[PDB]
Amino acid sequence: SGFRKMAFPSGKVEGCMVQVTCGTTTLNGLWLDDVVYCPRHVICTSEDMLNPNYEDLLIRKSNHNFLVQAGNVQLRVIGHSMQNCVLKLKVDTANPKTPKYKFVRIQPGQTFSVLACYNGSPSGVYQCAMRPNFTIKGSFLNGSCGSVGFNIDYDCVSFCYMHHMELPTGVHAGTDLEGNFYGPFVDRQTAQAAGTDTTITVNVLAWLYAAVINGDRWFLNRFTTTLNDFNLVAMKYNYEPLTQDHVDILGPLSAQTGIAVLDMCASLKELLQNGMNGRTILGSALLEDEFTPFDVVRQCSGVTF
Amino acid sequence: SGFRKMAFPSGKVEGCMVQVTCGTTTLNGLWLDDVVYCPRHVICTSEDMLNPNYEDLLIRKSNHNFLVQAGNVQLRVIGHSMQNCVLKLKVDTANPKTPKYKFVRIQPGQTFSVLACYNGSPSGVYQCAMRPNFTIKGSFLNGSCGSVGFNIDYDCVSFCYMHHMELPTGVHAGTDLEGNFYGPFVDRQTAQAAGTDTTITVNVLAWLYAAVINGDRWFLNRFTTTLNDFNLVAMKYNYEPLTQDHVDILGPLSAQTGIAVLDMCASLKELLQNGMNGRTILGSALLEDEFTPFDVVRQCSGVTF
Ligand SMILES: CC(C)(C)NC(=O)[C@@H](c1cccnc1)N(C(=O)c1cnc[nH]1)c1ccc(C(C)(C)C)cc1
Ligand SMILES: CC(C)(C)NC(=O)[C@@H](c1cccnc1)N(C(=O)c1cnc[nH]1)c1ccc(C(C)(C)C)cc1
């Protein structure tokens, strides 16, 4: 019993983290086989941050301008190139601790574990979600750039996020591992507005199912609703519309609890319209939207890696 | 910016988890050097769960009655002994991934990371706290027994908790690595209820300081208070008393923000007497008490391991 914000074990990713220094700038790199991946803004200076010409900057750099360190070992950079907003440093040594991995670009509403690193050394691990506006509400200090987000399937690490920068409201922006930013953000110091955010409806329903599995049932009513009538209420409260795919995705949790998805929608419909009256659900006084249906099934069925 | 439930990197602990099998019972063990540690109730049967004679059960066992498995590697048992409520299996092979470690018995209010395991394989990592009533509010399913809690100092792993059993209200009870239970709980099927819990006051104050660091300052008022006038209010709301040591421990956070501790106590007093009025602090509508002052400093200053 119990329900916690649970991350994947971080061991496979720890052995890939290195430190990348260019000039006076230090951040983190991902060492996989003989390539180190890091944010290309490492080559930027204070005189360039407003609108850097990364092509011109990279041309000026040589291999010896990149200091890559893996613990005590300094890795020689033998080549450097740029793929979108990610710098790829070819090094002379393949990482012997390279796990099975793949690069994945995730969808809004999906979650992943972050290994927060500073100076190439891991600091902590936590779980977060790709918001509908393509930001992430992470915990990142100066120099956290190059920390990665990931999921673990079978025995294969799916890398889905590299951290680049903080946004005015304190949220964070980054890329996939091919260097394509999530959302409209760019790697320069400029006025960047994140779009209006919405609540991930299918994740709230999954978290409500997690509550029922753990005995928290007070919010259940005897009503049901149609998918169209629910979305008229979800619209008013800035909730993502619910699709039939979302309903089918909640199939496993509905079968485990014996509560039809449209029944749970009617309970959530009443929660949005009436509030929670100062009561709690799974030790929270707000509706949580950063657990996917798969997350709840993983934690309430106990899969291992 | 940002503030998350952040666990330590789990790689050092992952390389210590093994599977222990006695008869038809399987749970997790901790492999350090040539010794495997696991809960002693693995030698218990269904007809013994009400009141088992562990002395009788151990003396009749032989080394070949224990199956220890580290992934695919079968560890041959060359000795077995019992210390309090933990079984110690001496194996022929020392764990080549044994990290710098020590065994530590934590105090109520201190936090630790939990690596949840099933069949000797890690499933996920999360952050927990030792409640004042000596339970932990974890996420543990059947067979999670033997999963450990830990803290990491530089490169030394301080093991502080081993999971044993679940209590009626869905909270969890366990031991330190010497086999001594936290609280008055015993490893048998009997009527044992956790005592009424209280809130960790020094942790709430540190969490308020984390909020001020992240720009959440609406709860700061013009009042101050004395240590005694605050403790009179904290006792009324089932909060743990605030000691002078707690004030000194909050020294770094008070100096970072420039807010005196007694000033923050006056803000917390108003929050307890008037509620939060539906407002949030760091994304939560309740007062969080599972961040120690050290946890706040670690996340807001960025120490690594
Ligand atoms: C853009 C603002 C808000 C001023 N700062 C950040 O985002 C900041 C930071 C702070 C906290 C968390 N994440 C990142 N960040 C760094 O800490 C950093 C860059 N290199 C090493 N460290 C950063 C990232 C990118 C840049 C550009 C060169 C692209 C403009 C500059 C600084
Ligand atoms: C005591 C109750 C509440 C009925 N069950 C648990 O606590 C339960 C469990 C369930 C969920 C989380 N943690 C533990 N638990 C096990 O899943 C287990 C034991 N060995 C392998 N698995 C367990 C622990 C201890 C015992 C005895 C000491 C009585 C023998 C029996 C079962």
XYZ file of C-alpha atoms and ligand atoms in Angstrom:
674
model
C 0.000 0.000 0.000
C 0.957 3.644 -0.334
C 1.564 5.909 -3.304
C 4.700 7.988 -3.826
C 6.320 10.036 -6.563
C 8.563 7.183 -7.684
C 11.462 7.493 -10.128
C 13.285 4.792 -12.044
C 16.518 3.423 -10.534
C 19.254 5.759 -11.725
C 22.278 3.437 -11.852
C 22.441 2.926 -15.620
C 22.350 6.687 -16.208
C 24.897 7.630 -13.510
C 27.659 5.788 -15.385
C 27.016 7.984 -18.443
C 27.348 11.423 -16.823
C 30.485 13.489 -17.500
C 31.627 17.093 -17.074
C 32.095 19.375 -20.099
C 33.993 22.655 -19.807
C 34.383 25.254 -22.555
C 36.219 28.376 -21.447
C 34.836 29.370 -18.050
C 31.562 27.479 -18.597
C 31.023 24.062 -17.009
C 27.954 21.836 -17.498
C 27.054 18.142 -17.890
C 27.417 15.733 -20.791
C 25.974 12.323 -21.654
C 28.694 9.793 -22.603
C 27.344 6.974 -24.816
C 29.804 4.837 -26.795
C 32.486 7.261 -28.100
C 30.233 10.365 -28.185
C 29.473 12.957 -25.492
C 26.180 14.862 -25.918
C 25.667 18.257 -24.287
C 23.822 21.550 -24.877
C 25.449 23.553 -27.641
C 25.149 26.735 -25.579
C 28.294 25.612 -23.704
C 30.230 27.368 -26.500
C 28.421 30.669 -25.830
C 29.872 33.657 -23.974
C 28.287 36.576 -22.132
C 28.885 38.809 -25.161
C 26.974 36.281 -27.299
C 24.073 35.201 -25.093
C 21.535 37.639 -26.565
C 21.760 36.247 -30.123
C 24.685 33.881 -30.700
C 25.660 32.696 -34.176
C 26.318 29.081 -33.216
C 27.662 28.225 -36.673
C 30.312 30.950 -36.415
C 31.047 30.092 -32.780
C 31.545 26.383 -33.509
C 33.844 27.141 -36.467
C 36.120 29.138 -34.143
C 36.392 26.241 -31.673
C 38.979 23.468 -31.812
C 38.974 20.056 -30.146
C 41.270 21.317 -27.363
C 38.730 23.999 -26.402
C 36.499 21.261 -24.921
C 37.642 19.762 -21.603
C 35.681 16.555 -20.965
C 36.170 14.816 -17.622
C 34.788 11.440 -16.479
C 35.642 11.277 -12.790
C 39.433 11.608 -12.715
C 39.944 10.644 -16.370
C 40.164 13.385 -18.990
C 38.693 12.243 -22.318
C 40.349 13.603 -25.455
C 37.882 15.170 -27.871
C 38.830 14.079 -31.404
C 35.885 15.667 -33.214
C 33.006 18.088 -32.675
C 29.755 18.664 -34.539
C 26.320 20.185 -33.990
C 22.946 18.447 -34.419
C 20.179 21.048 -33.942
C 20.828 22.433 -30.408
C 23.021 19.560 -29.132
C 26.804 19.515 -29.404
C 28.233 16.051 -30.130
C 31.844 15.575 -28.997
C 33.507 12.488 -30.437
C 35.975 11.137 -27.863
C 38.798 8.616 -28.206
C 37.368 6.184 -25.602
C 34.057 4.336 -25.731
C 32.154 4.377 -22.458
C 32.424 0.784 -21.134
C 29.341 1.355 -18.970
C 27.124 2.348 -21.911
C 23.765 0.625 -21.315
C 21.273 -0.494 -23.891
C 19.609 2.767 -24.878
C 17.433 4.528 -27.409
C 16.516 8.155 -28.097
C 12.793 8.952 -27.836
C 10.823 12.178 -28.299
C 7.928 12.064 -25.831
C 4.432 13.529 -25.995
C 2.891 16.113 -23.664
C 1.405 14.452 -20.607
C 4.011 11.685 -20.424
C 6.384 11.438 -17.457
C 10.058 10.617 -16.972
C 12.763 10.485 -14.312
C 15.393 13.248 -14.102
C 18.917 12.669 -12.800
C 19.954 16.166 -11.692
C 23.725 16.614 -12.088
C 26.305 19.318 -11.368
C 29.913 19.263 -12.620
C 29.274 15.837 -14.134
C 28.329 14.297 -10.757
C 24.794 13.099 -9.923
C 22.952 15.031 -7.211
C 19.490 13.473 -7.053
C 16.700 11.862 -9.018
C 13.030 12.787 -9.250
C 9.944 12.298 -11.400
C 8.383 14.967 -13.602
C 6.044 15.376 -16.554
C 6.155 17.081 -19.935
C 3.532 19.802 -19.483
C 0.992 20.453 -22.261
C 2.857 23.724 -22.988
C 6.140 21.758 -23.407
C 7.807 23.055 -20.242
C 8.816 20.905 -17.280
C 8.451 21.889 -13.624
C 11.856 20.609 -12.586
C 14.334 21.333 -9.815
C 17.423 22.750 -11.521
C 20.119 25.142 -10.290
C 22.860 26.944 -12.213
C 25.018 24.516 -14.156
C 22.404 21.746 -14.202
C 22.380 21.958 -18.022
C 23.023 18.604 -19.663
C 21.139 16.615 -17.024
C 18.868 14.110 -18.769
C 15.368 12.705 -18.361
C 14.691 9.048 -19.084
C 12.444 6.008 -18.804
C 13.474 2.373 -18.327
C 11.764 -0.360 -20.352
C 12.731 -4.033 -20.336
C 16.434 -3.370 -19.760
C 16.686 -0.461 -22.222
C 17.068 3.188 -21.195
C 14.911 5.533 -23.290
C 16.483 8.988 -23.136
C 13.856 11.639 -23.803
C 15.048 14.953 -22.352
C 18.209 17.014 -22.026
C 17.979 20.131 -19.862
C 19.015 23.447 -21.411
C 17.628 26.469 -19.592
C 15.243 28.063 -17.108
C 12.251 30.156 -18.201
C 10.952 33.356 -16.528
C 8.257 31.653 -14.422
C 10.825 29.287 -12.896
C 9.985 26.352 -15.194
C 12.462 24.615 -17.501
C 13.028 24.002 -21.214
C 15.103 21.434 -23.058
C 15.476 19.176 -26.078
C 15.210 15.603 -27.160
C 18.591 13.900 -27.606
C 18.603 14.871 -31.285
C 18.718 18.495 -30.121
C 15.148 19.486 -31.035
C 13.601 21.674 -28.346
C 10.283 20.701 -26.854
C 7.984 23.652 -27.509
C 8.778 27.005 -29.126
C 11.863 27.742 -27.036
C 15.325 28.727 -28.323
C 18.777 28.618 -26.710
C 19.478 32.336 -26.377
C 18.828 34.980 -23.729
C 15.599 36.523 -25.002
C 11.994 37.131 -23.981
C 10.332 33.709 -24.245
C 6.709 33.240 -23.212
C 5.555 29.720 -22.436
C 2.076 29.046 -23.758
C -0.874 28.775 -21.412
C -0.764 25.440 -19.576
C -3.609 22.979 -18.999
C -4.227 20.100 -16.590
C -3.541 16.575 -17.895
C -7.013 15.054 -17.454
C -6.117 11.410 -18.121
C -3.392 11.586 -15.465
C -5.801 12.991 -12.867
C -8.144 10.070 -13.540
C -5.264 7.605 -13.141
C -4.285 9.223 -9.829
C -7.907 8.993 -8.664
C -7.761 5.283 -9.508
C -4.542 5.023 -7.489
C -6.475 6.542 -4.579
C -9.252 3.934 -4.794
C -6.676 1.127 -4.881
C -5.254 2.563 -1.637
C -8.661 2.906 0.064
C -9.398 6.621 -0.534
C -12.976 6.441 -1.844
C -14.942 9.379 -0.387
C -15.066 11.217 -3.729
C -16.869 8.371 -5.522
C -20.476 9.065 -6.479
C -23.166 6.865 -8.008
C -23.385 8.928 -11.219
C -22.026 8.416 -14.718
C -21.530 10.807 -17.619
C -20.951 10.925 -21.350
C -17.550 11.793 -22.772
C -19.014 14.893 -24.444
C -20.754 16.202 -21.311
C -17.570 15.715 -19.287
C -15.454 17.692 -21.771
C -17.885 20.612 -21.491
C -17.033 20.783 -17.780
C -13.325 20.100 -18.322
C -13.196 23.028 -20.762
C -14.324 25.481 -18.066
C -11.579 24.367 -15.641
C -8.675 24.344 -18.132
C -8.518 20.547 -18.360
C -7.347 18.773 -21.498
C -10.236 17.163 -23.403
C -10.658 13.441 -22.803
C -10.589 11.188 -25.882
C -11.817 7.637 -26.366
C -8.135 6.645 -26.554
C -7.682 8.043 -23.033
C -10.702 6.038 -21.859
C -9.302 2.837 -23.383
C -5.858 3.566 -21.885
C -7.490 3.645 -18.424
C -8.869 0.132 -19.064
C -6.424 -1.673 -16.746
C -7.150 0.575 -13.758
C -10.900 0.435 -14.370
C -10.821 -3.376 -14.398
C -8.683 -3.610 -11.252
C -11.007 -1.355 -9.228
C -14.297 -2.278 -10.888
C -15.085 1.397 -11.574
C -16.013 2.346 -15.133
C -14.007 5.243 -16.559
C -17.133 7.290 -17.258
C -18.080 6.695 -13.609
C -14.752 8.145 -12.466
C -15.265 11.070 -14.865
C -18.536 11.811 -13.071
C -16.656 11.823 -9.753
C -13.997 14.160 -11.172
C -16.773 16.299 -12.670
C -18.181 16.734 -9.153
C -14.718 17.438 -7.696
C -14.056 20.294 -10.138
C -17.483 21.859 -9.557
C -17.620 21.466 -5.756
C -13.962 21.501 -4.729
C -12.538 19.140 -2.130
C -14.029 20.799 1.009
C -10.611 20.769 2.669
C -10.360 16.983 2.397
C -7.361 15.069 1.067
C -6.780 12.409 -1.581
C -3.633 10.287 -1.155
C -2.306 12.876 1.276
C -2.809 15.758 -1.172
C -5.210 18.706 -1.011
C -4.965 19.291 -4.789
C -5.672 17.094 -7.801
C -2.368 15.613 -9.031
C -1.795 15.350 -12.792
C 1.788 14.011 -13.059
C 1.099 10.260 -12.817
C 0.261 8.524 -16.095
C -1.989 5.438 -16.162
C 1.154 3.387 -16.798
C 2.872 4.984 -13.790
C 0.010 3.930 -11.504
C 0.011 0.388 -12.899
C 3.784 0.158 -12.437
C 3.606 1.266 -8.798
C 0.471 -0.745 -7.929
C 1.555 -3.969 -9.692
C 5.303 -3.851 -8.964
C 7.304 -4.268 -12.178
C 11.094 -4.348 -11.809
C 14.159 -3.416 -13.861
C 14.509 27.115 -9.347
C 11.819 24.598 -8.484
C 11.543 22.217 -5.554
C 10.858 18.484 -5.809
C 10.774 15.337 -3.708
C 14.361 14.425 -4.578
C 15.990 11.082 -3.753
C 19.668 10.201 -3.775
C 21.075 8.464 -6.865
C 20.494 4.761 -6.305
C 23.317 3.187 -8.315
C 25.479 2.332 -5.309
C 22.551 0.526 -3.656
C 21.309 -1.235 -6.817
C 24.536 -3.247 -6.947
C 23.807 -4.659 -3.484
C 20.286 -6.064 -3.954
C 19.926 -9.855 -4.084
C 17.107 -12.396 -3.948
C 16.771 -14.655 -0.897
C 14.603 -17.784 -0.941
C 13.813 -20.010 2.045
C 11.378 -22.788 1.212
C 8.568 -21.131 -0.747
C 9.200 -17.615 0.613
C 11.119 -15.111 -1.526
C 12.169 -11.590 -0.521
C 15.075 -9.155 -0.948
C 18.467 -9.139 0.725
C 21.343 -6.673 1.005
C 24.729 -8.039 -0.134
C 27.692 -6.245 1.475
C 31.138 -7.909 1.393
C 30.597 -11.645 2.114
C 27.369 -11.191 4.121
C 23.746 -10.920 2.968
C 21.239 -9.172 5.257
C 17.513 -9.909 5.048
C 14.418 -9.970 7.291
C 14.331 -13.018 9.549
C 10.661 -13.721 8.863
C 11.729 -15.353 5.543
C 12.043 -18.593 7.563
C 8.419 -18.234 8.692
C 5.532 -20.352 7.397
C 1.794 -19.762 7.092
C 0.979 -21.755 10.242
C 3.674 -19.853 12.188
C 2.763 -16.254 11.316
C 0.620 -15.684 14.425
C 3.430 -16.339 16.918
C 6.630 -17.827 15.460
C 9.452 -19.290 17.543
C 12.354 -17.873 15.543
C 14.973 -19.519 17.769
C 13.494 -22.939 16.966
C 13.153 -22.192 13.248
C 16.756 -21.034 12.777
C 18.540 -23.812 14.676
C 16.867 -26.479 12.493
C 17.919 -24.779 9.241
C 21.011 -25.669 7.214
C 23.036 -23.583 4.773
C 21.537 -25.384 1.773
C 18.026 -24.327 2.880
C 18.772 -20.754 1.718
C 18.816 -19.801 -1.974
C 20.694 -16.532 -2.573
C 20.735 -15.131 -6.109
C 22.471 -11.977 -7.380
C 20.924 -11.570 -10.812
C 21.895 -14.880 -12.409
C 24.828 -15.622 -10.079
C 23.966 -18.140 -7.361
C 25.742 -17.298 -4.099
C 26.562 -20.373 -2.026
C 25.769 -19.951 1.672
C 28.554 -20.978 4.066
C 26.994 -19.733 7.305
C 23.892 -18.240 8.853
C 23.116 -16.359 12.060
C 20.414 -14.126 13.521
C 20.917 -10.659 15.001
C 17.648 -9.391 16.476
C 15.176 -9.357 13.564
C 17.644 -9.645 10.645
C 19.141 -12.848 9.238
C 22.804 -12.752 8.193
C 23.853 -15.210 5.470
C 27.613 -15.626 5.051
C 28.402 -16.263 1.383
C 31.573 -17.508 -0.281
C 31.922 -14.462 -2.570
C 32.452 -10.870 -1.485
C 30.318 -8.396 -3.422
C 32.764 -6.616 -5.780
C 30.313 -3.691 -5.976
C 30.294 -3.119 -2.200
C 30.405 0.670 -1.673
C 31.725 2.603 1.280
C 28.946 2.019 3.780
C 27.932 2.293 7.402
C 24.895 1.307 9.460
C 23.055 4.206 11.097
C 19.950 4.387 13.290
C 18.075 7.572 12.395
C 15.893 9.763 14.634
C 12.217 10.582 14.060
C 11.988 13.443 11.583
C 15.008 12.537 9.458
C 14.532 11.534 5.821
C 16.045 8.899 3.538
C 15.733 7.424 0.053
C 14.034 4.049 -0.458
C 14.961 1.702 -3.309
C 11.884 -0.503 -3.691
C 12.751 -4.024 -4.845
C 10.943 -7.233 -5.778
C 12.693 -10.583 -6.323
C 16.060 -8.894 -5.778
C 15.512 -6.430 -8.642
C 15.109 -2.661 -8.135
C 11.721 -1.228 -9.127
C 11.893 2.465 -8.205
C 13.325 5.034 -5.819
C 11.538 7.621 -3.684
C 12.052 9.805 -0.620
C 10.586 8.917 2.794
C 10.719 10.152 6.385
C 10.780 8.472 9.787
C 7.527 9.635 11.371
C 7.399 10.628 15.059
C 5.373 7.444 15.692
C 8.215 5.395 14.103
C 6.330 4.367 10.966
C 7.135 5.330 7.377
C 4.582 6.239 4.712
C 6.188 4.327 1.859
C 5.030 2.493 -1.255
C 5.476 -1.247 -0.689
C 3.633 -4.217 -2.210
C 3.795 -7.915 -1.349
C 7.350 -9.232 -1.409
C 8.954 -5.788 -0.984
C 10.501 -6.949 2.312
C 14.258 -6.452 2.494
C 14.170 -3.211 0.501
C 16.470 -0.704 2.193
C 16.435 3.000 2.948
C 19.637 5.009 2.852
C 21.372 8.367 2.716
C 24.525 9.189 0.754
C 27.372 11.310 2.134
C 29.931 12.085 -0.583
C 30.706 8.471 -1.514
C 29.611 6.699 1.701
C 26.177 5.055 1.859
C 24.513 5.226 5.282
C 21.975 2.404 5.465
C 19.256 3.261 7.971
C 16.136 1.174 7.233
C 15.134 -2.316 6.107
C 11.495 -2.969 5.246
C 9.671 -5.762 7.080
C 5.903 -5.386 7.127
C 2.809 -3.259 6.563
C 0.589 -1.916 9.353
C -3.240 -1.743 9.350
C -3.524 1.889 8.183
C -1.281 1.222 5.174
C 1.917 2.569 6.762
C 5.071 0.491 7.038
C 7.369 -0.771 9.773
C 10.956 -1.929 9.649
C 14.320 -2.155 11.368
C 17.789 -0.721 11.231
C 20.519 -2.891 9.725
C 21.192 -4.420 13.160
C 17.676 -5.880 13.293
C 16.169 -3.470 15.834
C 12.675 -2.319 14.912
C 11.853 1.357 14.808
C 9.011 1.679 17.293
C 7.389 -1.074 19.356
C 6.421 -3.243 16.393
C 7.155 -6.967 16.136
C 7.534 -9.283 13.141
C 4.437 -11.422 13.637
C 0.766 -11.271 12.663
C -0.678 -9.575 15.736
C -2.770 -6.570 16.731
C -0.233 -3.727 16.668
C -1.542 -0.261 15.811
C 0.676 2.718 15.085
C 0.314 5.500 17.622
C -1.130 8.870 16.721
C 1.321 10.834 14.608
C 2.512 14.427 14.902
C 3.946 16.959 12.457
C 7.711 17.557 12.237
C 7.887 21.288 12.990
C 11.548 21.864 12.074
C 10.826 20.288 8.678
C 7.839 22.564 8.013
C 9.993 25.620 8.761
C 12.731 24.435 6.398
C 10.095 23.876 3.699
C 8.836 27.426 4.263
C 12.426 28.597 3.764
C 12.580 26.605 0.526
C 9.475 28.485 -0.620
C 11.038 31.878 0.139
C 14.108 30.840 -1.860
C 11.780 30.034 -4.775
C 9.870 33.333 -4.561
C 6.826 32.142 -2.560
C 6.607 34.810 0.156
C 2.889 35.595 0.643
C 2.823 33.939 4.097
C 5.416 36.324 5.584
C 3.770 38.678 8.094
C 4.896 41.706 10.104
C 4.794 39.824 13.419
C 7.481 38.042 15.403
C 7.254 35.719 18.402
C 9.248 34.035 21.151
C 10.237 30.369 21.190
C 7.861 29.631 24.075
C 4.828 31.430 22.634
C 5.327 29.447 19.426
C 5.675 26.079 21.190
C 2.413 26.746 23.037
C 0.662 27.039 19.662
C 2.580 24.121 18.127
C 1.570 21.833 20.997
C -2.094 22.678 20.371
C -1.924 21.629 16.694
C -0.029 18.363 17.358
C 3.276 19.769 16.099
C 6.574 18.575 17.531
C 8.232 21.062 19.907
C 10.869 23.390 18.487
C 14.190 23.224 20.333
C 17.154 25.584 20.335
C 19.105 22.989 18.348
C 16.380 23.190 15.692
C 16.869 26.961 15.581
C 20.636 26.550 15.131
C 20.102 23.860 12.467
C 17.982 26.355 10.501
C 20.921 28.792 10.616
C 22.076 28.323 7.010
C 18.548 28.798 5.633
C 17.869 31.892 7.745
C 21.157 33.468 6.633
C 20.507 32.649 2.966
C 17.110 34.399 3.071
C 17.828 37.038 5.713
C 14.716 35.979 7.660
C 15.085 35.271 11.372
C 13.791 31.915 12.580
C 11.423 33.505 15.110
C 10.063 35.672 12.292
C 9.298 32.503 10.323
C 7.767 30.905 13.425
C 5.345 33.835 13.626
C 4.384 33.239 9.992
C 3.822 29.524 10.630
C 1.767 30.367 13.731
C -0.622 32.440 11.620
C -0.820 29.621 9.062
C -1.828 27.128 11.763
C -4.407 29.474 13.300
C -5.928 30.791 10.054
C -5.219 28.037 7.517
C -3.890 28.666 4.023
C -7.171 30.150 2.673
C -7.013 27.913 -0.397
C -3.602 29.271 -1.426
C -0.614 27.091 -2.292
C 3.024 27.037 -1.201
C 5.531 25.413 -3.573
C 2.659 23.780 -5.439
C 1.074 22.266 -2.319
C -2.117 23.188 -0.462
C -0.876 21.554 2.768
C 2.126 22.195 4.996
C 4.841 19.716 3.977
C 6.931 18.168 6.763
C 9.125 15.590 4.975
C 12.030 17.901 4.036
C 14.786 18.273 6.630
C 16.780 21.527 6.750
C 19.673 19.591 5.205
C 17.384 18.407 2.390
C 16.468 22.010 1.584
C 20.127 23.081 1.610
C 21.149 20.140 -0.592
C 18.484 20.877 -3.208
C 18.903 24.669 -3.060
C 22.742 24.656 -3.073
C 23.371 21.587 -5.256
C 25.725 19.136 -3.543
C 26.623 16.026 -5.541
C 27.761 12.465 -4.858
C 18.894 31.820 -19.277
C 18.957 32.138 -17.789
C 17.551 32.193 -17.208
C 19.656 33.473 -17.578
N 19.748 31.111 -17.069
C 19.603 29.780 -17.159
O 18.746 29.210 -17.828
C 20.611 28.974 -16.322
C 19.924 27.887 -15.509
C 19.617 28.075 -14.172
C 18.896 27.118 -13.482
C 18.504 25.983 -14.158
N 18.795 25.758 -15.443
C 19.494 26.701 -16.085
N 21.720 28.512 -17.195
C 22.813 28.015 -16.570
O 22.830 27.833 -15.359
C 24.040 27.624 -17.337
C 24.387 27.835 -18.641
N 25.597 27.227 -18.823
C 25.946 26.680 -17.652
N 25.038 26.894 -16.712
C 21.752 29.044 -18.527
C 21.269 28.295 -19.596
C 21.353 28.789 -20.886
C 21.915 30.035 -21.144
C 22.011 30.584 -22.573
C 23.477 30.773 -22.974
C 21.351 29.629 -23.574
C 21.306 31.938 -22.662
C 22.385 30.779 -20.066
C 22.304 30.295 -18.773
C 1.644 -8.845 7.941
C 0.736 -8.550 6.754
C 0.136 -7.157 6.890
C -0.374 -9.587 6.681
N 1.524 -8.622 5.503
C 2.591 -7.868 5.188
O 3.076 -7.012 5.926
C 3.168 -8.127 3.794
C 3.504 -6.829 3.070
C 2.638 -6.281 2.140
C 2.914 -5.048 1.580
C 4.062 -4.393 1.971
N 4.927 -4.899 2.856
C 4.639 -6.096 3.379
N 4.296 -9.092 3.865
C 4.712 -9.611 2.686
O 4.234 -9.240 1.622
C 5.800 -10.639 2.629
C 6.415 -11.337 3.627
N 7.356 -12.125 3.025
C 7.284 -11.892 1.709
N 6.354 -10.998 1.411
C 4.440 -9.777 5.112
C 5.347 -9.323 6.064
C 5.511 -10.013 7.253
C 4.782 -11.166 7.521
C 4.985 -11.948 8.825
C 6.056 -11.283 9.695
C 3.679 -12.006 9.622
C 5.432 -13.381 8.522
C 3.872 -11.605 6.565
C 3.700 -10.922 5.374
